[PDB]
Amino acid sequence: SKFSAKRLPSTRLGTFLENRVNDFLRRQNHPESGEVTVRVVHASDKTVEVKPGMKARFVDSGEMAESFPYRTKALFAFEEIDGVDLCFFGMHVQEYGSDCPPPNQRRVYISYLDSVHFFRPKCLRTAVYHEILIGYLEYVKKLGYTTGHIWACPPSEGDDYIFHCHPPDQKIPKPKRLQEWFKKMLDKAVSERIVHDYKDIFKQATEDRLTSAKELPYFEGDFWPNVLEESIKEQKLYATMEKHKEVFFVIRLIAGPAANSLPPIVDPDPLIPCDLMDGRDAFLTLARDKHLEFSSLRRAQWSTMCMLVELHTQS
Numbered sequence: 001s002k003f004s005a006k007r008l009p010s011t012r013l014g015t016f017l018e019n020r021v022n023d024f025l026r027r028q029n030h031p032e033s034g035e036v037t038v039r040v041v042h043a044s045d046k047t048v049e050v051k052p053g054m055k056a057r058f059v060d061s062g063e064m065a066e067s068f069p070y071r072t073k074a075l076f077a078f079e080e081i082d083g084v085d086l087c088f089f090g091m092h093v094q095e096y097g098s099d100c101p102p103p104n105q106r107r108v109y110i111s112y113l114d115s116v117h118f119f120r121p122k123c124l125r126t127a128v129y130h131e132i133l134i135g136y137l138e139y140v141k142k143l144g145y146t147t148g149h150i151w152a153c154p155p156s157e158g159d160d161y162i163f164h165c166h167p168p169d170q171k172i173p174k175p176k177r178l179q180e181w182f183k184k185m186l187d188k189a190v191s192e193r194i195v196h197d198y199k200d201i202f203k204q205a206t207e208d209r210l211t212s213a214k215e216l217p218y219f220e221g222d223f224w225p226n227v228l229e230e231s232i233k234e235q236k237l238y239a240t241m242e243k244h245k246e247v248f249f250v251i252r253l254i255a256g257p258a259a260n261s262l263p264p265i266v267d268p269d270p271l272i273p274c275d276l277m278d279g280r281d282a283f284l285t286l287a288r289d290k291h292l293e294f295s296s297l298r299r300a301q302w303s304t305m306c307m308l309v310e311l312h313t314q315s
């Protein structure tokens with residue numbers, strides 16, 4: 001059909017991820033599973049600017065770059081259930097390439113991920129989310145990104161990351177459950193030899209014998225930029241790192257000498273301008289303004305169809 005998820009334009013990344021998920025589902029041979037479609041719907045160039053305190057201490061002194069360029073991508077996963085598309089998973093990532101100044105070079109960071117719990121069958125839902133994330137790490141590792149970063153931050157009560165109006169009975173995991181969920185994902189990646197290893201931020205920083213705040217990757221919207229500004233306004237930083245360590249993952253995709261002899265990162269996919277999916281706010285607002293909800297299967301399917309018409313006919 002004219003405005004289907006499958007007819008959204010393809011990318012190498014979307015294709016790679018959907019082939020992984022569908023091959024997984026085919027091996028499980030569950031009669032209730034439907035075809036999965038994965039589409040990158042936004043990609044654009046951005047920069048994160050170093051905030052005044054760090055800018056005063058380290059940028060002005062020529063010890064650290066003033067800003068760091070990255071590519072933002074938004075991708076969505078859809079499942080066919082009884083001939084109807086359901087959008088059930090979304091993710092926004094920041095990708096810092098090989099031209100980026102240290103300490104941000106060749107890193108990926110997950111800005112947001114969100115879901116609505118209607119994947120059929122339910123006994124495969126978590127496994128499918130893990131397959132998308134492991135496939136993302138698999139892909140960026142293939143391109144030459146060396147490290148992944150994840151802040152396990154659940155949304156505040158009443159706050160939706162990507163999808164407006166979640167089901168009333170979809171529980172939101174607490175930090176501890178969410179940490180264990182990312183670990184289970186990462187252990188599967190480790191056994192597939194995609195992830196070399198992973199550590200909490202304090203352990204990584206300790207084992208790498210990092211001297212200075214300038215050595216820590218500096219990402220848009222992350223915790224650590226704001227904690228650094230607070231630290232500069234008022235040794236304590238080191239105490240914050242340890243207390244909150246368990247919620248920040250540093251994921252090594254490529255370690256050893258092989259991590260230092262890499263060609264440049266060449267992303268084969270074009271930029272994809274799309275107003276609706278540049279950041280999270282725009283899609284939340286359109287849902288709010290069109291009275292869309294993702295609060296039941298049928299409402300989510302209706303909202304998915306509206307989302308798709310919009311994606312197809314913008315510009």
Ligand SMILES: CC(C)(COP(=O)(O)OP(=O)(O)OC[C@H]1O[C@@H](n2cnc3c(N)ncnc32)[C@H](O)[C@@H]1OP(=O)(O)O)[C@@H](O)C(=O)NCCC(=O)NCCS
Pocket residue numbers: 110111112113114115116117125126127129151152153154155161171172173174177178181
């Ligand atoms: C992260 C996410 C995709 C994981 O989904 P998931 O694979 O279904 O895993 P969850 O931990 O949410 O749920 C698994 C089980 O734990 C349960 N659970 C979740 N939160 C719970 C809570 N606070 N108390 C008790 N049980 C809970 C669920 O009900 C579910 O039960 P089931 O397996 O019997 O159906 C999803 O929780 C989500 O969309 N969260 C909101 C966005 C977010 O947290 N983003 C992460 C960082 S950007």
Ligand SMILES: Cc1[nH]c2ccccc2c1C(=O)CN1CCCC[C@H]1C
Pocket residue numbers: 110111112151152153220221222279
């Ligand atoms: C707050 C914020 N502002 C941005 C502007 C542009 C791009 C990204 C962000 C962004 C995030 O990524 C936040 N995110 C970080 C990872 C955990 C979940 C959550 C707390």
